[PDB]
Amino acid sequence: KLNIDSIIQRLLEVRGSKPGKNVQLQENEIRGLCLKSREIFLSQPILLELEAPLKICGDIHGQYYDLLRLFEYGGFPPESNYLFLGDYVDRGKQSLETICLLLAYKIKYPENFFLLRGNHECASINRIYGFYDECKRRYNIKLWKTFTDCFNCLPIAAIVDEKIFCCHGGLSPDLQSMEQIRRIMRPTDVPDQGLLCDLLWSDPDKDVLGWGENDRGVSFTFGAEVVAKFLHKHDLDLICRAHQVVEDGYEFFAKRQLVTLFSAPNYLDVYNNAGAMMSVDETLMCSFQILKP
Ligand SMILES: C=C1[C@@H](O)[C@@H]2O[C@]3(CC[C@H](/C=C/[C@@H](C)[C@@H]4CC(C)=C[C@@]5(O[C@H](C[C@@](C)(O)C(=O)O)CC[C@H]5O)O4)O3)CC[C@H]2O[C@@H]1[C@@H](O)C[C@H](C)[C@H]1O[C@@]2(CCCCO2)CC[C@H]1C
Ligand SMILES: [Mn+2]
Ligand SMILES: [Mn+2]
Numbered sequence: 456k457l458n459i460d461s462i463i464q465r466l467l468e469v470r471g472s473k474p475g476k477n478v479q480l481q482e483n484e485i486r487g488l489c490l491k492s493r494e495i496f497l498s499q500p501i502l503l504e505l506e507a508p509l510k511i512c513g514d515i516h517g518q519y520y521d522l523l524r525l526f527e528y529g530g531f532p533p534e535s536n537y538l539f540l541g542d543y544v545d546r547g548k549q550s551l552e553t554i555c556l557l558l559a560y561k562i563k564y565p566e567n568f569f570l571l572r573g574n575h576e577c578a579s580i581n582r583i584y585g586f587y588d589e590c591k592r593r594y595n596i597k598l599w600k601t602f603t604d605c606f607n608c609l610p611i612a613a614i615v616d617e618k619i620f621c622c623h624g625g626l627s628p629d630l631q632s633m634e635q636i637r638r639i640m641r642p643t644d645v646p647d648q649g650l651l652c653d654l655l656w657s658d659p660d661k662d663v664l665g666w667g668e669n670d671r672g673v674s675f676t677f678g679a680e681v682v683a684k685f686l687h688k689h690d691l692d693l694i695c696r697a698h699q700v701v702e703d704g705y706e707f708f709a710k711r712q713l714v715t716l717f718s719a720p721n722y723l724d725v726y727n728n729a730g731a732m733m734s735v736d737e738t739l740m741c742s743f744q745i746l747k748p
Pocket of ligand 1: 579580584670671672673700722723725726
């Protein structure tokens with residue numbers, strides 16, 4: 456009953472309009488996007504096994520027109536396949552248009568479009584950093600809770616061609632086998648510290664080789680040795696994550712065993728960072744497409 460094509464049409468109708476122009480979908484349409492995508496998320500693994508070619512994107516944080524710029528540069532679905540690493544809402548001015556377009560494409564192209572969970576796809580987080588307020592203003596809190604129920608079902612990681620491990624934050628001192636991830640049950644809010652918490656919040660740190668203290672006030676930091684042990688144990692070549700703002704949109708850490716992607720140019724209007732998107736072809740060759748602010 457949900458008219459996906461009309462929703463997409465209206466959402467894309469603003470590409471070319473003055474940045475900031477809102478697209479106000481009906482409440483029933485947004486709830487449908489949430490309920491239908493949730494079903495698909497639960498129907499697919501929590502640890503996705505994808506194949507190149509694919510375009511991987513980092514944080515978007517409600518910068519809708521920048522999301523439109525990414526698609527125009529990388530190709531609107533289904534021209535290209537996409538994998539987003541999380542943090543779709545909060546901070547930006549248009550989290551609603553942003554998340555709705557993404558859910559809409561997930562429903563429209565369930566086998567060629569994927570979305571991972573970021574720490575901002577968490578109630579306790581998006582309640583404070585913007586999304587809740589945006590829903591309260593343009594719609595209502597009940598709709599916000601519907602979004603939360605959808606987010607609690609997002610997959611947590613993906614492996615591209617058995618070589619690239621993708622997640623939002625990073626590793627966990629609790630992560631020993633890939634099975635541990637695959638066994639995580641949904642829906643789930645992340646109520647306790649531990650594996651899922653770390654996957655959503657950890658960061659690589661240049662100072663320590665093993666495990667360190669995280670300035671975020673949650674989770675930990677991990678060094679090059681930790682990364683090395685992980686990659687070899689699971690026969691992987693690289694970790695692709697997001698979660699941290701980087702100047703060039705992308706940046707390597709842990710002696711190039713990990714790459715961080717961030718796709719929200721000029722973050723919060725304060726940073727003058729660029730946004731980036733990483734393209735991976737069938738020859739498992741990695742390439743970066745930058746998006747200047
Ligand atoms: C969000 C965050 C963290 O990520 C953030 O990490 C730190 C370390 C590095 C990071 C810096 C980021 C900068 C680049 C940006 C640039 C701009 C312009 C603004 C700003 O924006 C930050 C938030 C946000 C969203 O914009 C982000 O970019 O991260 C806050 C500091 C701001 O100067 O910094 O700041 C320290 C402050 C910390 O503050 C909150 C943190 O308190 C959240 C807290 C840990 C949570 O705890 C709970 C309980 C425990 C388990 C987890 O859930 C409940 C929910 C919530 C209260
Ligand atoms: Mn994050
Ligand atoms: Mn983020």
